[PDB]
């Protein structure tokens, strides 16, 4: 027969762009060297503020999966974009005794759609009304952000770990005390000799003449050149390809828990990520900051995180990591949490659910999803860097360590 297909515009999975002036989809070839497959989508063109329906050209990962599923079972389809432009939610707006769904969920429950072929996440709140197949996308939750600077701390203890610096001091007193012993006021001359040799103070106060003490001091001066060459070495190594900052909160981080108006982390309104922080009473406080600073479309939050408007952005790992591989101004949070999966959605009484889901279980077994990945998740590299001017904050840090040592020295 003929069944309707509802989908939403998601950047990596479902591209929704209009056609040329003639009316057919522009034929193109991907960077791999393959014809990109597109179909017709009748939905609200966001270009016209009017919210009017207009057929278009749609293509992507979920489009290839929709053509594949249409090839597996002996059925045809008629794709159309979702009317309201959101994923879906359950609510009761005008009826205090009867509730309904909105989005693709609403069109499915109202009969306006027969199948959802978009990155639709599986969860328990939606499982009460629809039936899902075996997931076609393994993902999670990561806080996505656009991150800025080389130094957050004094640069003397950064290249050498605490064991290396403490070892250097232990050698300072091993050569000061071993020099006082081998050369046998005097203690201040030994400490001033070792410290003046390590710091190039050049006081010229005293010196021992014993071959044991001269060899000890030569090992101490050469070792001083090697430890300052290691501090300047690894200190110069953290100039290119520096380790990422802790702005990536992760599952259990302080930045994700505390709702400060300066570090704007938020979720898309009328979506699941708002329900993740709205249901938990502990995050209710954060929910407050999310209640007044939430965004509608995920692309608006992406542009806000690119325009330095939104600090962090908790979102699915597939989309956030994809935008991090496409727009290298943004990075996802480490320690991936809330691992879920995108899968197709069907109604309960449908028999297709038995076969189609099994087909997905077969679709993973043959490795077709790996080719779809090779097509629709490709990482575009960026500038590997560099920091340049960005050296002031550190220099103020190390200068703050020196000035702090001058204050503690004034107390002494």
């Amino acid at each position: 027969t003929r069944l309707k297909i509802v989908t939403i515009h998601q950047e990596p999975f479902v591209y929704v762009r209009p056609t040329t002036s003639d009316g057919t989809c522009r034929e193109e070839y991907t960077i791999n060297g393959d014809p990109i497959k597109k179909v017709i989508c009748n939905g609200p063109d966001e270009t016209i503020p009017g919210r009017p329906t207009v057929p278009q050209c749609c293509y992507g990962f979920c489009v290839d999966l929709l053509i594949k599923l249409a090839r597996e079972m002996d059925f045809t389809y008629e794709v159309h974009l979702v009317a309201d432009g959101k994923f879906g939610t359950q609510e009761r707006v005008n009826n205090s005794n009867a509730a309904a769904w909105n989005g693709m969920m609403g069109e499915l429950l109202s009969g306006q759609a027969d199948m959802i072929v978009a990155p639709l996440t599986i969860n328990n709140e939606r499982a009460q009304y629809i039936e899902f197949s075996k997931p076609f996308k393994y993902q999670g939750l990561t806080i996505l952000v656009k991150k800025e600077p080389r130094s957050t701390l004094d640069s003397f203890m950064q290249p050498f770990q605490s064991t290396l610096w403490l070892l250097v001091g232990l050698s300072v007193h091993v050569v000061a005390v071993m020099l006082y012993l081998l050369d046998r006021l005097t203690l201040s001359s030994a400490m001033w000799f070792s410290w003046r040799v390590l710091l190039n103070s050049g006081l010229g106060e005293g010196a021992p003449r014993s071959f044991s003490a001269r060899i000890l001091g030569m090992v101490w001066a050469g070792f001083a050149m090697i430890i300052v060459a290691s501090y300047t070495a690894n200190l110069a190594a953290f100039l290119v390809l520096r380790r990422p900052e802790e702005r990536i909160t992760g599952i259990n981080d302080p930045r994700l828990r505390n709702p400060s108006d300066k570090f704007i982390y938020a979720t898309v309104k009328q979506s699941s990520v708002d329900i993740y922080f709205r249901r938990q009473v502990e995050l209710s406080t954060m929910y407050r900051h999310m209640e007044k600073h939430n965004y509608e479309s995920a692309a608006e939050a992406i542009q806000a995180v690119r325009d330095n408007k939104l600090h962090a952005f908790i979102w699915d790992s597939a989309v956030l990591e994809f935008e991090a591989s496409q727009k290298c101004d943004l990075v996802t949070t480490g320690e991936l949490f809330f691992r879920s999966g995108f899968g197709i959605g069907m109604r309960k009484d449908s028999p297709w659910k038995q076969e189609v889901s099994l087909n997905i279980l077969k679709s993973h077994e043959n490795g077709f999803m790996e080719e779809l990945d090779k097509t629709w998740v490709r990482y575009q590299e960026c500038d590997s860097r560099a920091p340049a001017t960005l050296t002031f904050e550190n220099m103020a840090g190390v200068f703050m360590l020196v000035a702090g040592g001058i204050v503690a020295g004034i107390f002494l």
Partner: protein
């Protein structure tokens, strides 16, 4: 509602521990679970069934679910070992017992494939698992002395001595020995307390040595920053580079990939690459620990295995020599799932229970308590390690004790 469940033993998903003989019953987390042995026995040629206590991750899922949906359970283990393989149209193992109706539900280390999904049903995925390969890398990397070459010693000391011998005489209240300590001190980044020469010609040669100082310093700064700026990388080819599943040979003399015979990974590799079916069936392993020893003792280049079980192992490895090829690559993308009766069953409500364990965050707390490994628990562990400082301090301290040997030899020559 006594519901008997059949399961298999594979840590840490299902840890089996004998009952405490002092307490008799099972203590703490563990739920009662029997196990019956055909080959040997005490009475009735096998009729006696041993009693055990089962605790772990999936066991906590079965007991917690048993508390949520209010269905009681008398756990039972599988006698014939398998995962989800079917032979000659007859299935054996956990999914085999799920098809044989000997267990209403089956929770454990059971993978979800199409062959089982066609004959039995599964729930929502609990953990992402698939086909993956594991190989071990030797911790062979090796340190600040590495910067300067061996020409540093002979050339530098020789030139110094010759120059103070030649230069001192180009230099030509008190006169204190030789100023070679001033030259070597100047080589080690100024910091020289020695008195410079008062002559006019010596103001030239010393300057030259200053050159030979700073340049050497620069080398000691460049080259120590050269060998240390090459770390934290891996260049093994991705995207099925070895081709061993189809063509066993590669740029390496051999690629060995083993699968558990009559297993889900072997059947999936048997149905994917027939060359991998022949070479995997010829290189079929016995147990998992035997293949792990084959990967640690150099007896096997790689292994092909479940992905999650190998993912928890990274923490397990000590000194973490071992690692998962691809920094977390997954090939099949399937999931674990509790088996249910075909067509008919509580499947919907039980699935609500699973996704409820995911909704309450119990997967994150369980992964933090069970899954999390001291290893890699920290974010990635740029900073100079203790090995380089050990390299320098071995020579500094070696020259310190050797300086004391120069003091004892100075005493042996002083007593003359």
């Amino acid at each position: 509602e006594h519901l008997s469940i059949v399961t298999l033993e594979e840590a840490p998903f299902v840890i089996v521990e004998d009952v405490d003989p002092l307490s008799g019953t099972c203590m703490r987390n563990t739920v009662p679970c029997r196990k019956q042995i055909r080959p040997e026995n005490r009475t009735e040629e096998g009729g006696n069934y041993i009693k055990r206590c089962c605790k772990g991750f999936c066991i906590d899922i079965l007991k917690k679910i048993a508390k949520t949906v209010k269905f009681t359970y008398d756990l039972y283990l599988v006698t014939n070992g398998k995962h989800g393989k079917k032979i000659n149209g007859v299935w054996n193992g956990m999914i085999g017992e799920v098809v044989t109706k000997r267990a209403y539900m089956a929770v454990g280390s059971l993978t979800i494939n199409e062959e089982r999904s066609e004959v039995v049903d599964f729930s929502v995925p609990f953990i992402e698992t698939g086909i993956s390969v594991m190989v071990s890398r030797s911790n062979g990397t090796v340190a600040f002395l590495e910067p300067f070459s061996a020409d540093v010693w002979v050339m530098m000391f020789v030139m110094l001595l010759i120059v103070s011998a030649v230069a001192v005489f180009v230099f030509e209240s008190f006169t204190i020995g030789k100023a070679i300590w001033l030259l070597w001190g100047l080589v080690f980044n100024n910091s020289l307390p020695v008195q410079n020469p008062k002559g006019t010609t010596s103001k030239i040669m010393v300057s030259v040595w200053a050159f030979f100082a700073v340049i050497f310093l620069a080398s000691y700064t460049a080259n120590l920053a050269a060998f240390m700026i090459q770390r934290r990388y891996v260049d093994q080819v991705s995207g099925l580079s070895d081709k061993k599943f189809q063509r066993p040979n590669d740029f390496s003399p051999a690629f060995r990939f083993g699968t558990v015979p009559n297993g889900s990974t072997e059947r999936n590799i048997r149905n994917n690459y027939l060359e991998m079916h022949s070479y995997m069936v010829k290189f079929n392993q016995r147990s998992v620990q035997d293949a792990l020893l084959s990967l640690k003792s150099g007896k096997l280049d790689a292994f092909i295995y479940d992905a999650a079980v190998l993912n928890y192992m990274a923490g397990r490895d000590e000194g973490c020599k071992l690692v998962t090829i691809g920094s977390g690559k997954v090939f099949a993308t399937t999931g674990y799932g509790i088996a249910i009766q075909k067509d008919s069953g509580w499947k919907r409500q039980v699935d609500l229970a699973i996704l409820q364990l995911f909704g309450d965050g119990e997967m994150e707390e369980l992964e933090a308590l069970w899954l999390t490994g001291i290893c890699h628990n920290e974010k990635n562990e740029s900073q100079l390690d203790i090995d380089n400082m050990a390299g320098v301090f071995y020579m500094l301290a070696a020259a310190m004790a050797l300086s004391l040997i120069t003091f004892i030899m100075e005493h042996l020559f002083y007593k003359s």
